[PDB]
Amino acid sequence: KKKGVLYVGRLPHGFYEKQMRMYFSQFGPVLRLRMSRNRKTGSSKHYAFIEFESLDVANVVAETMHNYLLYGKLLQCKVIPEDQVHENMFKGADVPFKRIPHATIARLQHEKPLSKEKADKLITRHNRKLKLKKRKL
Amino acid sequence: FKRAETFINNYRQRERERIRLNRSAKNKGDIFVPDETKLLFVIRIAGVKNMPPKIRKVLRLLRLSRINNAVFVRNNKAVAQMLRIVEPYVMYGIPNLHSVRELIYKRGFGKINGQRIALSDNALIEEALGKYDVISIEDIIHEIYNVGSHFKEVTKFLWPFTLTPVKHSLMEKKVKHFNEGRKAGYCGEEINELIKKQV
Amino acid sequence: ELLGSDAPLEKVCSALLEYESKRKSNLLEDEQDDIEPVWLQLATLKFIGNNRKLIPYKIAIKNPVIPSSSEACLIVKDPQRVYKDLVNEAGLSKVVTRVIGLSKLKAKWNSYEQKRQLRDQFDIFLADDRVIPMLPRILGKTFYQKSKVPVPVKISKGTAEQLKREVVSAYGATYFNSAPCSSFMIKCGHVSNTSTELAENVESILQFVSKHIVPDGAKGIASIHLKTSQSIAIPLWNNPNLKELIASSRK
RNA sequence: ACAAUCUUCUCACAUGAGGUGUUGAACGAAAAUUUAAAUUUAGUUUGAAAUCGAUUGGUGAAAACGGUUUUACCACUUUGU
């Protein structure tokens, strides 16, 4: 009935979204699963949130997987009450992350086909850029 | 039921394979291509769940889509590149005359009408490969060993072998994850010993 | 002169030293001779790096940037008794404080806390040339992001005199870690260096950069600045031909 | 099945080129840059620590019927020889 949201922390490296759903769906159906990831690189933040169709199922999973010695880490499973569970907390759940290679895009942005007008829009007033430093002197 | 450690263990193995594949393919486009032999014997030793799709496809191209499958392949650059890609799962070496004869005489099955049919009589071989001057098992053996003109046709006709490890000893029957001690990679002449245990 | 047919050095660095000295403004007990380092900035017209090459560039310099009192941890391929004996034989104990085999480094320091403890125990981490590739693992971002990158000391043959030569060369050389970017910062020294010494360091670094970092050297160079951890990036020199170089390259 | 392939050196002629591999979070200075967000980046703190804060450009590989959903490092050599 009530959708129970479960926080899992201290996830061993490799216990990611596919592994969590495949494992936690055993206890019962899993509605939305999102494991936090860094903006720049998309690497795991080692904690996640899961939605279970019934709060009682989330209670059972919390009582069985909390302090689980897994790959040298104790797995922290605790149910978040709905009053601090936020509606946006599942934003981007079940959707694979896109590792944008900002270094690669910036590389192409550095070395891409360019025309005379864009070169003029690049040089601008570099003399003023030098002049600003000269005023700082 | 499955426990969380297996899911993590699978992931670490998958990323282990991903790192190996990138290293082997990128900046390591070199293969040693075992020489002084035009024939190779390859057997599928291991397999992993959620196998990388590139490995999954290369295995079926080599016709090693199931564990304990054994295939005769021609020693060339193309096979060696694919064999390097799927190295951790396959054991390969140089089969001698005794192994090739024994494998064909004892564990050779032909794809007749598209089913696995035992090569018990030369009548089927003559009917299936008569147009290539292949009439007997010995014709199959000669073609395979010498890599003749119709080596491509003979290999396609031949069904992959099933060299499942044999557990005769009481210790072999009891120990866990027994696979005869089958290592992975290139063994050279040792595959004849592995063949001798199976045939 | 290699820069743009001119060398606007000397005066620029003397001014930087005068600025650094002049902007001076409990008591503490664990004091060191640490001074603000000298940072040479260099902007190129293209990304000099395809990917972060976690192996530093042994830019040989005549005024060492590493203080001679710095303790060194030597990372060698196992066995470890062999190179411990060689260090003692060559009298590097005051310099090569600890020698660690590779497997022992992989086993005894597995925690990040253990990795951090080992990292802070030493000032420089020398590593055998044939075990550098292993070190991106076993050390992780605790070393390779927190300003402790192992140095590739070449001790393959392993005799007393080569060890001494490699170590003194290791201290005598500055290091830069190539990363994908157009602008990069290289250490030239510290304020304790005189104006002439830093200028000697600058020209030697630029000679190394033009050959082994920028494929087209000075033509690839866009602008150069001198700086410390806090000061203005004082422009040492700017390209006089970049107006046409950018047009030719970006077409 | 909490086991697995993160390299214990290469090639060329003492010399040159190569090795593609980094936990997350927090604090923080001032610099070059590129086309407001993005790349390098001093210096620090930390039990493999965690309670919303996800950024969103490009490449195609299979099912499916030219759309559609599925990849949980597919990155510009860009997802199945």
Determine whether the interchain pair B8/A22 forms a contact, defined as Cβ–Cβ distance below 8 Å: no
Of A14, B13, A41, the closest CA to residue C52 belongs to: A41
Contact B155, B40 (CB under 8 A): no
B and A in touch (3+ CB pairs within 8 angstroms): yes
Q: For every residue of C105-152, which 3-state class applies, written as one string?
A: HHHHCCCHHHHHHHHHHCCEEEEEHHHCCCCHHHHHHHHHCCCCCCEE
Per DSSP, the residues of B86-129 read: TGGGEEEE---HHHHHHHHHHH-EEEETTEEEE---HHHHHHHH
The helix/strand/coil state of B70 is: strand
- B120 token code pair: 């018990």
What does DSSP assign to residue B130? G
Rounded-to-integer distance, Cα B100 and Cα B98, Å: 6
Measure CA A114 to chain center: 35
Residue pair A61/A77 in contact (Cβ under 8 Å)? The answer is: yes
- Of B78, B95, B100, give the one whose Cα is nearest residue B37: B95
Give the Cα separation of C120 and C107 in Å (integer). 18
Residue pair C93/C123 in contact (Cβ under 8 Å)? The answer is no
Q: Look-up: residue for tokens 């001076």?
A: C24
From first CA to last CA, the distance across chain A in angstroms is: 70
- DSSP of B26-40: TT--------S-SEE
CA distances from C130 to C76, C107, C134 (A): 8, 19, 9
Distance CA C96, CA C77 (A): 16
Question: What is the rounded distance in angstroms from the CA atom of residue A56 to the CA atom of residue B15?
Answer: 35
Non-local (6+) Cβ contacts of B89 within 8 A are B44, B45, B46, B47, B48, B55, B59, B64, B184
Q: Are C64 and C38 in contact (CB under 8 A)?
A: no
Q: Does B177 contact strand D, using a CB cutoff of 7 Å? A: yes
C-alpha span between C17 and C88 (Å, rounded):
40
Q: In residues, how long is chain A?
A: 137
List phi, psi (to 5°) of B56.
Answer: -60, -40
Please name which of A34, A57, A54 lies closest in space to residue A44, comparing C-alpha atoms: A34
Q: Is the CB atom of residue A29 positioned under 7 angstroms from any atom of strand D?
A: no
A92-109 b/e with 16+ CB inside 10 Å = b? Answer: ebeeebeeeeebeeebee
C118 touches C93 (CB < 8 A)? no
Residues whose CB falls within 8 Å of the CB of residue C2, separated by 6 or more in sequence, listed in order: C206, C207, C210, C217, C218
How far is the CA of C150 from the CAs of A18, C86, C137, C201, in angstroms? Answer: 36, 20, 12, 22
B8 touches strand D (CB under 7 A): yes
Residue C115 to residue B32: CA distance in whole angstroms: 39
Report the interhelical angle of B53-61 vs B77-85 (nearest 10°): 140
Helix (H) or strand (E) segment spanning residue A52: strand A44-52
Residue A72: phi, psi to the nearest 5? 80, 5
Q: Give the helix/strand (H/E) hosting A75.
A: strand A73-80
In angstroms, how far is CA B129 from the centroid of its own chain? 23
C243 touches chain A (CB under 8 A): yes
The structure was resolved to a resolution in Å of 2.8
> Residue B187: what are its φ and ψ, rounded to 5°?
-110, -20
Contacts of A9 in chain B (CB under 8 A): none
Placement of tokens 């210790």 in the chain = B171
Nearest residue for D79, CA–C1': B53
Pairing between β-strand B90-93 and β-strand B185-188 as defined by DSSP bridges = parallel
C230 interfacial to chain A (CB closer than 8 Å): no
With helix as H, strand as E and coil as C, how does chain C read?
Answer: CCCCCCCCCCHHHHHHHHHHHHCCCCCCCCCCCCCCEEEEEEEECCCCCCCCCCCCEEEECCCCCCCCCCCEEEEECCCCHHHHHHHHHCCCCCCEEEEEEHHHHHHHCCCHHHHHHHHHHCCEEEEEHHHCCCCHHHHHHHHHCCCCCCEEECCCCCCHHHHHHHHHHHHHEEEECCCCCCEEEEEEEECCCCHHHHHHHHHHHHHHHHHHCCCCHHHHEEEEEEEECCCCCEEEEECCCHHHHHHHHCC
Distance A4 CA to D63 C1' (A): 34
Question: Nearest nucleotide by C1' from A37 CA?
Answer: D54
Q: Which structural domain, as residue segments, surrounds residue C119? A: 57-174
Q: Is the peptide bond before C64 cis (omega within 30 degrees of 0)?
A: no
Residue C200's CB is within 10 A of a number of other CB atoms, namely 19
Would you state the structure tokens that stand for residue A72, as one six-digit string?
A: 């040298």
Residue whose C-alpha is closest to residue C205's, from C16, C29, C65:
C65
Q: At B186, is the secondary structure helix, strand, or coil?
A: strand
CA distance B189 to B195: 11
Which method was it determined by? cryo-EM
C-alpha B99/C-alpha B101 separation (Å) is 6
The C-alpha atoms of residue B33 and residue B81 are separated, in whole angstroms, by 9
How far is Cα C249 from Cα C251, in angstroms, rounded to an integer?
Answer: 6
- A131 CA: distance to closest CA in chain C (Å): 11
Token match 């391929």: residue? C77
Q: Which chains have 3+ CB pairs within 8 A of C?
A: A
Distance, CA of A61 to CA of A68 (rounded, Å)? 11
Residue from A18, A94, A12 nearest A51 by CA: A94
Q: How far is CA B163 from the centre of its chain?
A: 9
CATH number, domain at C146?
Answer: 3.40.50.790
Torsion of Cα atoms, C164 then C166 then C169 then C171, to 10°? -80
Instruction: Indicate if the alpha-carbon torsion angle B182, B185, B191, B193 is positive or negative.
Output: negative
From B1, B8, B15, residue closest to A19, measured CB to CB: B8
Q: Distances in Å between the alpha carbon of C57 and those of A95, B93, C76, C151?
A: 41, 43, 19, 9
**Which of B2, B7, B15 minimises the CB distance to A15?**
B7
Question: Does the CA dihedral A98-A102-A107-A109 come out positive or negative?
Answer: positive
Q: Are strands C72-76 and C96-101 parallel, antiparallel or unpaired?
A: parallel
Closest CB from A107, A113, A130 relative to C180 = A107
Rounded Cα distance between B5 and B16, Å, is: 16
A27 contact partners, CB below 8 Å, separation of at least 6 = A52, A57, A60, A61, A64
Torsion of CA B119, B122, B127, B129, to 10 degrees: 70
Q: Are B153 and B140 in contact (CB under 8 A)?
A: no
A33/chain C closest Cα distance in angstroms:
28
Please answer yes or no on whether B4 and A19 come within 8 Å at the CB atom. yes
Residue C2 and residue C206 in contact, taking contact as beta carbons nearer than 8 Å? yes
